[PDB]
A paper describes a structure:
SDHTT5 interacts with a helix of NDUTT5 protruding from the membrane arm of CI, and with the Surf1-like protein subunit COXTT8 (CIV). Although it is exposed to the membrane region, at a distance of approximately 60 Å from the Fe3S4 cluster, the non-canonical haem C is located too far to participate in direct CII electron transfer.
We purified the intact respiratory supercomplex from mitochondria of the ciliate protist Tetrahymena thermophila and determined its structure by single-particle cryo-electron microscopy (cryo-EM). Here we show that a supercomplex containing all four respiratory chain components contributes to membrane curvature induction in ciliates.
Residue numbers in the entry:
A (entry chain CF): 149 to 296
B (entry chain CK): 1 to 93
């Protein structure tokens, strides 16, 4: 609750962004927050399959209604709860908060860096970050540069 | 002492070649009723026992978690992330 309050609201773009490290982020973020109503579609499909089986083999309707409920019950039991999804949601929300803070810093100083950015794009043809390039440069200096 | 004479005789002298064919359909019907009353009745109790601790004691099932720090990248409009492994522990009692 505390982390979600700080974030406020989550948009699908950020979820798809974090999909890189957790492909099941949507499947986990649905089981933590009351976003949308979840129907046990897999359970209902298995129930319909059992219904077709019973219809073929002429079972009483009580049996097929019970065999429709049962897979649905299993799906619901395996869906709800699942507090591990809450841990994964916490991790995603931490990532999202850091990303949003950095994005706000980007927007705040965008005008200040316009000129430097224009100068930089014309000299470096790489899109890699400045931090990574500078760490690589520091390692290159530490290795090849003569101590003298 | 109980007069088990006839039962003793039955135990001592029993046929050793008599057998009865079993209707496969009825055997299967009874066994699947047994499975119905196991999965759908005792399954509830078994799943409760297995899962309820995992609902009321979740922290012991996820030992390690990850934390992130972010920095801007103005000249490329990117965001740089540094990760860190932590022991998933209680917080803000
Ligand atoms: C990832 C890959 C996974 C693959 C999974 C594969 C699963 C395969 C499951 C196969 C199930 C076969 C079931 C066959 C049932 C046969 C029943 C039978 O022969 O008896 C018929 C009988 C008819 O009833 P009656 O009232 O006498 O009517 C007369 C009609 N002539 O009927 C009765 O009297 C009632 C019979 C009740 C049957 C209950 C069935 C319960 C099945 C529980 C399955 C649980 C599986 C859990 C899997 C978890 C996975 C996470």
């Amino acid at each position: 609750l505390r982390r979600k309050q700080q974030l406020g609201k989550i948009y699908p773009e950020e979820v798809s962004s974090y999909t890189q490290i957790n492909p099941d982020i949507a499947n986990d973020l649905n089981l933590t927050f009351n976003a949308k109503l979840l129907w046990p579609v897999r359970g209902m499909t298995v129930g319909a399959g059992f219904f077709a089986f019973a219809h073929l083999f002429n079972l009483p309707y009580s049996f097929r209604l019970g065999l429709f409920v049962l897979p649905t019950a299993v799906e619901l039991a395996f869906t709800w709860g699942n507090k591990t999804s809450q841990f994964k949601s916490i991790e995603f929300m931490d990532y999202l908060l850091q990303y949003r803070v950095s994005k706000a810093l980007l927007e705040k100083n965008a005008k200040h860096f316009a000129e430097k950015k224009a100068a930089y794009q014309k000299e470096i043809n790489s899109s890699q970050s400045v931090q990574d390039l500078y760490n690589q440069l520091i390692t290159l200096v530490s290795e090849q540069a003569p101590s003298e | 002492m109980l007069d088990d004479t006839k039962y003793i005789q039955m135990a001592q002298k029993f046929p050793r070649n008599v057998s009865v064919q079993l209707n496969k359909k009825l055997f299967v019907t009874r066994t699947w009723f047994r499975n119905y009353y196991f999965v759908g009745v005792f399954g509830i109790f078994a799943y409760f026992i297995y899962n309820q601790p995992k609902i009321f004691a979740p922290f012991s099932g996820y030992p390690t978690t990850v934390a992130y720090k972010a920095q801007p990248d103005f000249l490329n409009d990117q965001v740089i992330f540094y990760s860190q492994q932590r022991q998933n522990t209680l917080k803000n009692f």
